[PDB]
Amino acid sequence: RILPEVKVEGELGGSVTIKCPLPEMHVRIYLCREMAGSGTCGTVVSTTNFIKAEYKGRVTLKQYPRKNLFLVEVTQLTESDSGVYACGAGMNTDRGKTQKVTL
Amino acid sequence: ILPEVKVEGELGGSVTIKCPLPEMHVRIYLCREMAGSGTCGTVVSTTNFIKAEYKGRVTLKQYPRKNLFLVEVTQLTESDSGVYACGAGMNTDRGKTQKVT
Amino acid sequence: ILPEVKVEGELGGSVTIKCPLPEMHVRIYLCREMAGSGTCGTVVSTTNFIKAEYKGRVTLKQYPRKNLFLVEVTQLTESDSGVYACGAGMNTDRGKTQKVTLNVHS
Amino acid sequence: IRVFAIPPSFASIFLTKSTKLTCLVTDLTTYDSVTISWTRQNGEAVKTHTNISESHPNATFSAVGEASICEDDWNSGERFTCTVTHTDLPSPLKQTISRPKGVALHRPDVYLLPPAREQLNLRESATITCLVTGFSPADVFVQWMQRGQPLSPEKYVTSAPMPEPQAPGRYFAHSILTVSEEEWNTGETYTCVVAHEALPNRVTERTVDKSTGKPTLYNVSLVM
Amino acid sequence: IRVFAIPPSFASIFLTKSTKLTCLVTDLTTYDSVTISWTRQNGEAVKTHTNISESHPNATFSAVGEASICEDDWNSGERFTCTVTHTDLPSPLKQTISRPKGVALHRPDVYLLPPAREQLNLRESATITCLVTGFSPADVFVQWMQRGQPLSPEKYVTSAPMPEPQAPGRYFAHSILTVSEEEWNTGETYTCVVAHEALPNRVTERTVDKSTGKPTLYNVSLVM
Amino acid sequence: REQLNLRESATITCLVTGFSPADVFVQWMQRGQPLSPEKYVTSAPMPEPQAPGRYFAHSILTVSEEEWNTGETYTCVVAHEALPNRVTERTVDKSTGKPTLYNVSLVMSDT
Amino acid sequence: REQLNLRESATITCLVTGFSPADVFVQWMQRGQPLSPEKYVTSAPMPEPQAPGRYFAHSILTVSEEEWNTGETYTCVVAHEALPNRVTERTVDKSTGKPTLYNVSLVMSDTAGTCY
Numbered sequence: 001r002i003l004p005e006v007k008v009e010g011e012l013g014g015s016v017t018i019k020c021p022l023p024e025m026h027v028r029i030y031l032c033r034e035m036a037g038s039g040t041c042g043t044v045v046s047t048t049n050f051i052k053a054e055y056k057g058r059v060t061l062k063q064y065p066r067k068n069l070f071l072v073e074v075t076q077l078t079e080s081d082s083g084v085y086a087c088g089a090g091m092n093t094d095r096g097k098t099q100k101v102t103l
Numbered sequence: 104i105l106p107e108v109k110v111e112g113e114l115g116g117s118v119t120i121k122c123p124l125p126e127m128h129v130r131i132y133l134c135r136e137m138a139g140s141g142t143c144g145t146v147v148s149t150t151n152f153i154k155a156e157y158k159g160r161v162t163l164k165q166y167p168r169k170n171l172f173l174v175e176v177t178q179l180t181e182s183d184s185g186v187y188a189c190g191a192g193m194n195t196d197r198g199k200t201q202k203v204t
Numbered sequence: 205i206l207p208e209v210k211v212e213g214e215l216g217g218s219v220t221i222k223c224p225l226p227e228m229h230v231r232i233y234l235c236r237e238m239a240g241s242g243t244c245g246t247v248v249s250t251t252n253f254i255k256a257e258y259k260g261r262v263t264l265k266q267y268p269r270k271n272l273f274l275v276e277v278t279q280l281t282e283s284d285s286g287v288y289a290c291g292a293g294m295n296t297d298r299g300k301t302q303k304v305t306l307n308v309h310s
Numbered sequence: 311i312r313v314f315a316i317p318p319s320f321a322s323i324f325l326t327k328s329t330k331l332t333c334l335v336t337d338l339t340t341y342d343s344v345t346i347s348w349t350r351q352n353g354e355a356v357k358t359h360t361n362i363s364e365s366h367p368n369a370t371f372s373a374v375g376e377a378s379i380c381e382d383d384w385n386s387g388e389r390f391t392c393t394v395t396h397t398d399l400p401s402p403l404k405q406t407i408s409r410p411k412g413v414a415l416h417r418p419d420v421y422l423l424p425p426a427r428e429q430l431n432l433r434e435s436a437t438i439t440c441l442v443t444g445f446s447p448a449d450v451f452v453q454w455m456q457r458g459q460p461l462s463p464e465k466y467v468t469s470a471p472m473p474e475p476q477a478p479g480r481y482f483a484h485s486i487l488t489v490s491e492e493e494w495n496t497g498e499t500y501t502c503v504v505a506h507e508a509l510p511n512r513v514t515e516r517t518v519d520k521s522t523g524k525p526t527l528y529n530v531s532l533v534m
Numbered sequence: 535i536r537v538f539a540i541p542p543s544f545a546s547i548f549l550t551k552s553t554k555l556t557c558l559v560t561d562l563t564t565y566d567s568v569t570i571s572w573t574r575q576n577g578e579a580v581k582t583h584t585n586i587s588e589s590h591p592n593a594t595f596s597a598v599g600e601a602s603i604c605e606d607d608w609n610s611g612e613r614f615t616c617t618v619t620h621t622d623l624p625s626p627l628k629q630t631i632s633r634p635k636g637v638a639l640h641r642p643d644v645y646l647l648p649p650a651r652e653q654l655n656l657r658e659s660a661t662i663t664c665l666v667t668g669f670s671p672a673d674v675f676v677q678w679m680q681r682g683q684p685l686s687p688e689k690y691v692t693s694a695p696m697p698e699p700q701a702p703g704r705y706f707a708h709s710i711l712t713v714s715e716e717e718w719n720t721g722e723t724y725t726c727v728v729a730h731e732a733l734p735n736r737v738t739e740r741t742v743d744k745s746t747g748k749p750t751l752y753n754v755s756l757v758m
Numbered sequence: 759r760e761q762l763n764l765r766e767s768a769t770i771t772c773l774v775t776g777f778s779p780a781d782v783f784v785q786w787m788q789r790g791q792p793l794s795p796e797k798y799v800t801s802a803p804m805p806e807p808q809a810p811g812r813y814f815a816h817s818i819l820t821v822s823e824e825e826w827n828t829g830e831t832y833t834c835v836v837a838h839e840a841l842p843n844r845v846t847e848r849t850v851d852k853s854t855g856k857p858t859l860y861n862v863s864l865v866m867s868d869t
Numbered sequence: 870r871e872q873l874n875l876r877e878s879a880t881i882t883c884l885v886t887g888f889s890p891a892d893v894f895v896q897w898m899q900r901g902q903p904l905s906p907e908k909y910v911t912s913a914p915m916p917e918p919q920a921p922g923r924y925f926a927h928s929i930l931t932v933s934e935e936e937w938n939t940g941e942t943y944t945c946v947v948a949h950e951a952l953p954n955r956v957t958e959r960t961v962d963k964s965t966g967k968p969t970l971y972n973v974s975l976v977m978s979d980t981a982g983t984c985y
C-alpha cells in the first residue's frame with residue numbers, strides 16, 4: 001500500500017503530475033478516485049478511452065515502459081477535494097489498486 | 104461538493120444562492136435538512152411548493168444561458184442557517200447535487 | 205426551537221414561561237422532562253391537572269391574539285427546576301414545541 | 311318571476327342540526343325587503359328574510375329568504391308547501407317539495423389510504439384519501455377530523471358521488487386531504503368523518519397514520 | 535343565440551384515435567333546413583355533417599353537427615367555423631373553435647394506491663386507486679390494463695377532474711379499478727395508463743403489485 | 759396505554775363481577791397501607807349482563823403515572839360474604855403483563 | 870426475469886463491445902458442441918456512442934425456459950484479430966448469479982417435541 005502524496009498546491013493554476021508504478025504486462029491501468037464514502041474508487045482515466053466528466057479535457061496519460069511508470073497529468077487542476085487517487089491495473093478496479101495518491 | 108456559499112446575516116437582509124441547473128428540464132429544488140428526521144426537506148421546487156415557514160419570503164429564478172437556479176430568501180428572520188441542498192429529480196432526498204450552508 | 209430563558213428565583217417571585225399558542229386548541233401543557241427515566245412529566249396542561257408538588261402555585265393564561273400561552277409559577281418554592289417544554293397535542297412526550305432551560309438559583 | 315326550490319341537504323342538516331327549506335325567485339330585480347313567502351303544509355312555518363343585496367351585476371338580483379322546521383320533518387317524507395310572495399313578482403303562488411323516498415339504504419364502507427411512497431419521496435406534500443363505498447341515498451358528507459377537531463374546509467376536496475361499477479344502486483366518493491410531508495412523517499393520525507343516512511348512528515370515523523401499515527409483532531431492520 | 539359546439543376531448547381523441555368535429559347544438563331549434571357547414575377558419579368548408587341525425591327540435595339539435603376531421607392541426611392548430619342557416623334564420627349562426635388554446639400544460643403525476651388492509655381483510659373485494667394530480671390543462675384519459683391487456687371499462691370508473699386545492703390551476707382525478715381479493719393476493723400487474731397532452735409522449739403508466747411495498751431483501755413469516 | 763400516552767393520570771380499575779347478594783366493599787392499598795378515599799371511587803352494584811343472579815361493580819383509582827411508570831404495587835382488596843375468607847386481593851404493576859421481548863440480532867454476511 | 874416468468878422461452882445475450890476493427894465473429898457453444906447457426910442471431914457491428922473508433926455487436930441465443938432451468942452452460946465464443954488467442958469464451962448458467970441465501974429461522978416458545 002505505497003502512499004505517495006503529490007500534494008500539488010498550485011490550486012487553480014496548478015497542473016498536477018503523478019507517476020504511478022506500471023507492471024508493463026499490457027494490462028489496462030486506471031487512476032481511481034475514492035467516491036464519497038462508497039469505497040469503490042471511480043476511475044478518472046484508464047488505458048480504456050474512458051475519461052470522467054469532471055476530469056475530462058484536463059486529464060492526460062503518458063507512458064514510460066523503460067522507466068516502468070505511467071504519468072497522469074491534471075492540467076487545469078482546479079480544486080476538487082482530492083481523496084486517495086489510487087492508480088492500479090487490472091480489469092477489476094477497486095481490487096487491483098496498488099499506489100494511493102493524495103492531492 | 105459542499106460549497107456553502109452564503110452564511111450571510113441580517114434580520115431583514117436578502118440572501119441569493121446560485122444553484123446548479125442541469126437543464127434536462129428536470130425538477131430543480133432548494134431543500135433543507137432536518138436534524139430530527141435526518142432527511143432533507145423541500146422548501147422550494149419547480150413544482151410550486153412553498154414551505155410553511157417560508158410562505159412568500161423565498162423566490163426562485165431560472166437562467167438557462169448561465170445555467171443558474173437562484174434562490175432568494177428576501178426576509179431572513181434569522182432562523183437557523185440550515186445546511187441547504189440543491190438537487191434535481193423527483194427524489195428530493197437522494198437527488199441532491201450541492202450543499203449550501 | 206429552544207428559546208431557553210433562565211429566570212430569577214424568589215420565594216414569592218412569579219417566574220413566567222412563554223409558550224406558543226398554535227390556535228389548534230389541543231391540550232397545551234408544560235413538561236418537566238425526567239432525564240433519568242427519559243420520559244416527559246407534565247406539571248400543568250390545558251386540562252385542570254396540576255402536578256402534585258406544583259399544586260396551588262402554577263397558573264396558565266391564553267392569548268390567541270398574541271399567539272401566546274402564559275405559564276406563571278406565582279409561588280416559587282425554588283425546588284429542582286429542570287428543563288421545561290411548552291407543548292401541544294394529546295401526546296405529551298412527542299408534543300413538545302419549545303424547550304426552555306431555566307435555573308432559579310440565579 | 312322564476313320559481314326555484316332548493317331542498318335541504320344532508321350536509322346542512324348535519325352541520326347546523328336544523329333542516330332549512332329553501333325557495334328562491336329569479337328574473338326579478340330587488341325592490342325592497344327581498345324575500346320569499348314561507349309556509350309549511352299547514353302554513354305555520356312563516357319565517358323571516360335574509361341575504362339582502364341591493365342588485366345583481368345586471369341589477370336583477372334574486373331575492374333570498376329562509377324558513378326553518380324540525381330536522382326530522384324533512385326525513386318524515388311528508389310534502390312541505392312554501393308560499394312565494396314578493397313585491398316584484400306579479401302574482402304570488404306556492405310550491406311543494408319533499409325528500410324523495412323509496413330509496414335503498416346501504417351502509418357506507420370507509421377506507422383510508424395513505425400517500426404513496428413516491429409522493430412522500432418528493433417531500434413536498436402528501437394526499438391521504440378517504441374512500442367511501444356502497445352508500446346510496448346518494449348522499450355523504452365527509453369531513454376531516456385530526457388532532458381532535460376539524461380542519462379548514464379548503465384543505466380537503468370531496469368528489470361528487472358517482473355510481474359504482476359493479477353495484478348499481480351503491481355509489482362512492484373520494485375525499486383527498488393534502489398535508490405537508492413532515493406532519494405525516496412525524497406521526498399524526500388524521501381522522502376522516504363520513505356522515506351519512508344509512509349509518510347506524512349516522513357518523514363513522516376512521517384513523518390512519520404512519521404506523522398503521524407497519525406490522526406490530528415482528529420488527530426486522532436491515533443494517534449496513 | 536349561438537351554435538353550441540362539442541369540441542373533441544383528448545380522452546375522445548385518444549380513445550377514438552381521430553377527431554370528431556362537432557357542432558350539434560345543445561339547446562337550439564331544429565325545425566328543418568339547419569345546415570351545418572364545417573368550415574375551416576380559411577373558409578374552406580371541408581366535410582360537413584355527414585351522417586346527420588333526425589329533424590327533431592327537442593329544445594336542442596337532434597340532427598348532428600358531427601363530422602370527422604384530422605387532428606394534427608385539425609383539432610389543434612387553427613379553428614373550425616360552423617355556420618348554421620336555419621329555415622327561420624336569415625343570418626346564419628356561425629362559430630369557430632380553437633380547442634380552447636392558451637392553457638398552461640402540466641405533466642400529471644400518477645400514484646397507484648393499493649387496496650386498504652381492512653378491505654382485503656373483509657375479503658369481499660378490493661379497489662386499486664390511480665390518483666392523478668398536478669395536471670395543467672385539465673383533460674386526462676385514464677385506463678387500466680393487466681399484463682398488457684386493456685381491461686373492460688365496466689370494472690373501473692374514473693372521476694372527472696376537479697381543481698386541486700393547494701395549486702389553483704392544477705387538477706386531480708381518481709380512477710379506481712375494483713378487483714377481487716383473490717385476484718389481488720396473487721400477483722397481478724394492474725397497470726394504470728394515463729393519456730394526457732402534457733405528458734412526455736402523452737402516455738405514462740405505473741403498476742402496483744401485492745408485493746409492491748414489501749421490502750424485497752427479507753421474506754419474514756410467522757408460523758403458528 | 760392510550761392515556762399513559764399523556765402523563766396526567768392513570769386510572770386503574772378493579773372489575774368485581776359475578777357475585778351475589780349484591781354488596782361488596784372494595785378498597786385499595788399501596789404497600790399494605792390503605793389509600794385515602796378521595797383517590798378512588800367505586801361504582802354501585804349493577805345486575806349482570808348475561809347471568810341473572812350475579813352482579814358486577816367497578817372501582818377506579820386515579821393515580822398519576824409518575825407513581826405508575828415507576829412501578830407501584832397498587833393492590834385492590836375486595837370484601838364480600840361469599841368469599842371463603844370474606845376477603846380477596848389482586849395486584850398490578852407497571853410490569854404485570856409484559857410478554858418476553860425476543861430481540862435477536864444476526865450478523866451473518868461475513869460468511 | 871420476465872421471460873422466465875412467461876416460461877415460453879428465454880434470450881441469452883452476448884454483448885461484444887469495444888473492439889476497434891469492425892469485423893468480429895461470435896458463435897455459441899453448448900457442452901463443447903457448437904450450436905446450429907439458426908438458433909443464435911448476431912447483430913452487425915455498429916459504432917459505439919461513447920467510443921469513436923470502437924464498435925459493438927450483440928448476439929442472442931434463444932433457448933427454452935426449461936433448458937435454462939436445467940442449469941446449462943451456454944458459452945459464447947468470440948473471434949477477433951485483437952484477441953490474444955484470436956478467441957475468448959464466456960460462460961453463464963442458471964447458477965451464475967445467486968449469492969447464498971441465509972434462511973434464518975427463529976424457533977421460540979414452540980413445541981412438536983421435534984428433536985433439535
Ligand SMILES: CC(=O)N[C@@H]1[C@@H](O)[C@H](O)[C@@H](CO)O[C@H]1O
Pocket residue numbers: 753754755757972
Ligand atoms: C416459512 C418460510 O418462510 N420459509 C420458506 C419456505 O416456506 C419455503 O418452502 C422455502 C423455499 O421457498 O424456504 C423459505 O423461503
Ligand SMILES: *[C@@H]1O[C@H](CO)[C@@H](O)[C@H](O)[C@H]1NC(C)=O
Pocket residue numbers: 529530531
Ligand atoms: C422497528 O424497526 C425500525 C427499523 O429502523 C426501528 O427504527 C425501530 O426502532 C423498531 N421498533 C422498535 C420498538 O425498536
Ligand SMILES: *[C@@H]1O[C@H](CO)[C@@H](O)[C@H](O)[C@H]1NC(C)=O
Pocket residue numbers: 753754755
Ligand atoms: C415467502 O416466499 C414464499 C415462496 O413461495 C411465498 O409463498 C410467501 O408468501 C413469502 N412470504 C410472504 C410473507 O409473502
Ligand SMILES: *[C@@H]1O[C@H](CO)[C@@H](O)[C@H](O)[C@H]1NC(C)=O
Pocket residue numbers: 972973974
Ligand atoms: C429454508 O428452506 C428450507 C428448504 O425448503 C425450508 O423447508 C425450510 O422450512 C426453510 N427454513 C425455514 C424453516 O425457515
Ligand SMILES: *[C@@H]1O[C@H](CO)[C@@H](O)[C@H](O)[C@H]1NC(C)=O
Pocket residue numbers: 984985
Ligand atoms: C437439517 O436438514 C436436513 C435436510 O435433509 C434435515 O433432514 C435435518 O432434520 C435438519 N436438521 C435438523 C436438526 O432438523
